[PDB]
Amino acid sequence: LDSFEILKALKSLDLLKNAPAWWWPNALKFEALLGAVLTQNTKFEAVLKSLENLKNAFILENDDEINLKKIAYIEFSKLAECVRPSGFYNQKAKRLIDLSGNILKDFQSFENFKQEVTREWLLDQKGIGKESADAILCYACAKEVMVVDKYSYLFLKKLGIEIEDYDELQHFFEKGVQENLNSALALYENTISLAQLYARFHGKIVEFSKQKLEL
Numbered sequence: 683l684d685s686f687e688i689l690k691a692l693k694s695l696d697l698l699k700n701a702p703a704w705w706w707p708n709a710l711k712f713e714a715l716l717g718a719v720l721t722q723n724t725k726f727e728a729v730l731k732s733l734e735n736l737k738n739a740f741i742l743e744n745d746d747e748i749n750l751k752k753i754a755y756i757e758f759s760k761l762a763e764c765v766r767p768s769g770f771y772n773q774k775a776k777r778l779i780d781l782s783g784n785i786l787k788d789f790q791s792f793e794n795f796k797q798e799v800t801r802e803w804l805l806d807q808k809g810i811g812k813e814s815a816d817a818i819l820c821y822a823c824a825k826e827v828m829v830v831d832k833y834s835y836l837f838l839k840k841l842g843i844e845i846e847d848y849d850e851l852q853h854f855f856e857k858g859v860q861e862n863l864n865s866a867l868a869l870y871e872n873t874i875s876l877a878q879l880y881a882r883f884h885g886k887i888v889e890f891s892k893q894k895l896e897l
């Protein structure tokens with residue numbers, strides 16, 4: 683049992699029929715990074731509300747470079763109010779503002795950030811965990827990184843393989859793909875990237891998990 687076998691089996695379930703191409707809505711945009719941070723320790727449904735708040739308040743509009751600067755310079759207590767629904771809202775506002783200000787400071791623009799960010803840089807941002815860091819890397823920056831989480835741990839454990847450590851679990855999941863790269867890609871069309879494959883693969887596990895299915 684490896685992650686390629688799991689991908690094929692999950693894929694044949696058609697779990698993403700209703701999803702966008704990268705699973706995460708508004709993938710590859712600033713909003714994906716905001717979601718990746720806001721989703722920590724909460725339900726994604728709640729994250730969607732925070733983003734709705736941000737949009738309804740015209741804090742987030744159509745230009746991501748403007749959006750980045752808006753979040754970096756927004757009054758703490760206003761942002762904190764906005765992201766109430768996803769909980770831990772004072773911590774997350776501070777986290778987002780510091781992150782956004784540090785992106786500007788180190789990378790000048792969100793565009794350049796998407797190109798130059800590393801996991802270690804993200805991990806040096808106070809409050810950003812591996813999962814969030816990785817979700818930013820994959821779902822906001824199109825990097826070849828597969829997010830893992832509690833879902834993936836529990837999903838694998840049920841299939842008979844237990845990997846508690848975040849990095850080893852992720853390596854287990856990435857390596858089965860890497861090892862069968864051409865055959866994994868061939869499941870699609872040779873249309874999509876490996877980053878998108880990971881984006882979708884993690885999506886499948888999440889969806890599989892919410893739907894309460896058996897492999």
Ligand SMILES: c1cn2cnc3[nH]cnc3c2n1
Pocket residue numbers: 705706707721726888
């Ligand atoms: C449905 C779509 N989703 C996108 N991104 C997420 N991050 C965590 N859960 C989700 C999710 N559920």
